């Protein structure tokens, strides 16, 4: 119940929300059915529209009018936005000639630069090019102020999940919205777009923007908009809010545009009927910055354009319907559309089994547009698995197409959509930084929107929150204000062992024809393995150790590691492959080597027979023995303490990606450094796992089984360089490949690798900043390069889309 009884007189879009059963007046109160009697009235005038004419300057005061023209309209506050322009011989601020702002120009009483963030929902990437014609105001803010050419939303290119990601810099398996729909089986309670259990805060994880500032002592604009609010009324609203005294005026305030979204998914988003909506956020965003030239704020305010999602093209035709792939259609519930969630209808079916809704999902028809994942199996660089409102089974589901379970369902309204895998080009969306704060004329790399939040913190001057950005990986975004952080302090010193126990010592099981039998070259072999070659091959520095462990550094002619004696295996292989090397084969008598390592002890090492009893497990290498610098070398490549479990399908990917692959990139980026290892996620939180969360093991041993495995790929950014004898910034791909017993995934794996290996590491693809999440390893201690370059170097994501 809401008494409405109760008055909005000298409320209007009051920032603190009065609790029930009193009438609200907050920007939000339509959305509660709460508004008192008379908000219409006071609250949202429309009179006379939004826009001064010449015969309106110097009017009496009207109080009815939605805005004002009268002399004492900027003392209170509430001119029209173009009042200064029609009234008093003013330019508007998109004529203006741009100007850098070196300082901070605030009137008296601004303790800090305020923050406008604009948000546009569905603006596609590309349409700051394509549009830019239409939008001269935007176009402004992009080239006098900081802009990327994209940002990368997160998963799925949702608007709730994004617009939260944007206020928390979290994921959204962990701030909670997962989507725009979902059910939480704790809660035993829906989430929609549309209705009230939405605004209930056990949702919302995290600590959003406005939280952040309010703790702090920054008080805050009310970010959401109810939809009704027509978007010159939000304008004028956050200008009003801008002239209340210092002491009630917000430092951090929020405009929301549904557009171009709205018409997006109606027209497509290069529907001819787009160029209107266009036209209109750019009205939208010339009526704010003549606002803020009004009053003197134009070089005081730090503004952000920024997106949610882009869009696609999506039409009722290109739907796949379970009802074509399953037997047992009703007994699941999905969630539909550019990506799949499904679950079991009813959790009393003790008939419902995963297993068979996935083989019954998996490569089915030969042209299928979705596939299926356990949620554990979904590319790492999603983040899309640690929530239990994240079904267990996912469709990834192809752009352009949907996905549903039956016919009538889709029963053509529509030629727009998004949702898709975060990296597809139409998906990207758009950053535009302008202010004293931003730099001038700037272009920065593409990046993703979990790395705003601390931005904005340090924009506001605030301490962030816990979250995933990386902050200081946007520093040459600022002019001032930047983080300067600090690498963080190894935890765990390795030893460096020699030679300490006798070859007899050891009942492995393995066996090796390497008695095959000198001054000359027994003190340079002596040399390698005291590390003289550990220069050419670990580039950047040893990665440090950032937790509690026991673990050996293990120097060779060609490759260096750090070898776990917790879990019997390297954490990390680091070893570098010039343009100029050759690729060989393994002998014939090597391939079943493996050799005890003199340096580490039989109770630290793996042996050869618990993968001679392990039927399902295999094993392969971590530096290549295709990659030995020599005949001699070679040896060292078949080393116990190089070897790892490997299910035989996946060793068919490991073995292409290091005969072949390797190779092609040391030819294509001059030379390569790189660093592989395993990783155990097995309770899918993107979080290194300790020894007690291993779920699986070579049978009969203590030799953990990997979820998966990665590796780091660096070269020289300018290729005419050598990846050893780089001096500038550094170059960087990397992946984290599922370590699974079938290539079910890859639904071409009956082909010859070259046809499908490539394309399922592309779909892997990973930040150096996922797998140092992944494993407490801290990458690139030491370079040339500056703290800040390196941080945003580890939050690059090699995305294989086109330009
Ligand atoms: C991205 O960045 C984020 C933010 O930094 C990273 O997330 C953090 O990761 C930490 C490790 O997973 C985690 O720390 C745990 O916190 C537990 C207390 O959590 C509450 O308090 C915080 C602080 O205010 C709050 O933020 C939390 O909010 C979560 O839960 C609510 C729902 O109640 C949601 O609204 C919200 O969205 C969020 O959910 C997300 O995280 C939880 C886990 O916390 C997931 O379950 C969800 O799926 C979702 O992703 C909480 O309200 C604390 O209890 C934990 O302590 C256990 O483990 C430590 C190890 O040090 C040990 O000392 C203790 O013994 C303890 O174990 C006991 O509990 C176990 C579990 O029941 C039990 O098995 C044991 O036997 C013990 O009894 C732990 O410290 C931190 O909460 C989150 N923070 C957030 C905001 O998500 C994230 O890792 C980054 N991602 C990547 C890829 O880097
Ligand atoms: C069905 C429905 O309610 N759709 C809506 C969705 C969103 C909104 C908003 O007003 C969002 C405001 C906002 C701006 C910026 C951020 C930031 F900073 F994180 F980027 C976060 C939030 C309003 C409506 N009406
Ligand atoms: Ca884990
Ligand atoms: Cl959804
Ligand atoms: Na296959
Ligand atoms: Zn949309």
């Known amino acids: 119940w809401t008494a409405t009884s109760g008055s909005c007189k000298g409320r209007c879009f009051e920032l603190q929300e009065v609790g029930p059963p009193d009438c609200r007046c907050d920007n939000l109160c339509k959305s509660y059915s709460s508004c008192c009697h008379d908000f219409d009235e006071l609250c949202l005038k429309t009179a006379r529209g939004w826009e ?323 949620k554990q199996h979904l590319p790492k660089r999603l983040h899309y698995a640690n929530n239990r409102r994240i079904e267990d089974i996912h469709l990834l589901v192809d752009r352009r197409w949907h996905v549903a379970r039956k016919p009538l369902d889709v029963y053509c309204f529509f030629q727009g959509d998004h949702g898709f895998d975060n990296k597809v080009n139409s998906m990207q969306t758009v950053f535009v930084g302008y202010g004293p704060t931003f730099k001038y004329r700037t272009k920065v790399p593409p990046f993703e929107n979990i790395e705003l939040y601390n931005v904005m913190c340090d924009l506001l001057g605030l301490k962030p929150a816990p979250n995933n950005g990386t902050h200081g990986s946007l520093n040459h975004l600022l002019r001032t204000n930047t983080f300067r952080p600090t690498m963080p302090d190894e935890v765990s010193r390795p030893n460096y062992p020699g030679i300490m126990y006798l070859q007899s010592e050891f009942d492995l099981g393995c066996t090796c024809d390497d008695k095959v039998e000198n001054k000359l070259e027994e003190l340079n072999k002596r040399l390698h393995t005291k590390g003289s070659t550990k220069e050419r091959h670990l580039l950047y520095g040893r990665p440090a150790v950032l937790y509690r462990t026991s673990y050996d550094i293990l120097y060779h002619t060609d490759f260096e590691s750090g070898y776990s004696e917790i879990f019997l295996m390297p954490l990390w292989t680091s070893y570098t492959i010039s343009k100029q090397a050759e690729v060989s084969s393994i002998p014939e008598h090597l391939t079943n080597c493996v050799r005890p390592d003199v340096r580490v002890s039989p109770g630290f090492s793996q042996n050869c027979l618990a993968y001679k009893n392990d039927k399902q497990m295999s094993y392969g290498f971590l530096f290549p023995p295709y990659l030995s610098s020599s005949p001699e070398a070679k040896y ?115 082909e010859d690798e070259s046809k499908w290996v490539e394309e399922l590491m592309k779909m892997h693809t ?30 690059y994501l090699h995305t294989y889309e086109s330009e």
């Open 766 to 795: 990973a930040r150096v900043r996922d797998i140092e999440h992944l494993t407490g390893l801290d990458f690139y201690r030491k370079t040339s390069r500056s703290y800040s370059e390196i941080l945003t170097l580890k939050t």
């Open 636 to 750: 060292d490549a078949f080393l116990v303490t190089n070897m790892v479990p490997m299910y035989p399908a996946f060793k068919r990917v490991w073995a292409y990606f290091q005969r072949v692959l390797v190779k092609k990139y040391a030819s294509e980026r001059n030379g390569v450094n790189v660093i592989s290892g395993p990783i155990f996620d097995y309770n899918y939180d993107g979080l290194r796992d300790t020894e007690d969360e291993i779920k699986q093991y070579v049978e009969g041993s203590s030799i953990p089984v990997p979820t998966h495995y990665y590796s780091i790929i660096t070269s020289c950014l300018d290729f005419t360089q050598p990846a050893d004898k780089c001096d500038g910034p550094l170059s960087v791909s990397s992946f984290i490949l599922p370590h699974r017993p079938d290539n079910d995934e890859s639904c071409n794996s009956s």
């Open 52 to 374: 001064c004419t010449k015969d309106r300057c110097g009017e009496v005061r009207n109080e009815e009018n939605a805005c004002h023209c009268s002399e004492d309209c900027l003392s209170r506050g509430d001119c029209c936005t173009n009042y200064q322009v029609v009234c008093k011989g003013e330019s508007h601020w998109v004529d203006d000639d741009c100007e850098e702002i070196k300082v901070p120009e605030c009137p008296a009483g601004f303790v800090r630069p305020p923050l406008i963030i604009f948000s546009v929902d569905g603006f596609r990437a590309s349409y700051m090019k394509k549009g830019s014609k239409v939008m001269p105001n935007i176009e402004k803010l992009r080239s006098c102020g900081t802009h990327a050419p994209y940002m990368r939303p997160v998963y799925p290119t949702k608007t709730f999940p994004n617009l939260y990601t944007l206020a928390t810099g979290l994921y959204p398996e962990s701030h909670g919205i997962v989507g725009n729909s979902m059910y939480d089986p704790v809660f035993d309670a829906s989430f929609h777009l549309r209705g009230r259990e939405k605004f209930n805060h056990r949702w919302w994880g995290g600590q959003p923007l406005w939280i952040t500032a309010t703790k702090q002592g920054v008080r805050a604009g009310t970010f959401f908009w109810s939809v009704s609010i027509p978007h010159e009324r939000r304008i004028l609203t956050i200008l009003q809010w801008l002239s209340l005294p210092d002491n009630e005026r917000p430092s951090v305030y929020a405009f929301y545009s549904e557009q171009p979204d709205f018409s997006g998914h109606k027209y497509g988003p290069f529907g001819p009927e787009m160029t209107n909506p266009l036209r209109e956020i750019d009205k939208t965003v010339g009526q704010l910055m003549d606002g803020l030239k009004q009053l003197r704020l134009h070089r005081c305010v730090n503004v952000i354009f920024v997106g949610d999602h882009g869009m696609e093209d999506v039409t009722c035709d290109r739907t796949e319907f379970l009802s074509n792939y399953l037997t047992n259609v009703d007994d699941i519930t999905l969630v539909p559309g550019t990506l799949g969630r499904i679950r079991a209808k009813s959790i009393n079916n003790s008939k419902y089994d995963p297993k068979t809704i996935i083989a019954a999902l998996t490569c089915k028809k030969p042209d299928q547009h979705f596939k299926p994942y356990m």
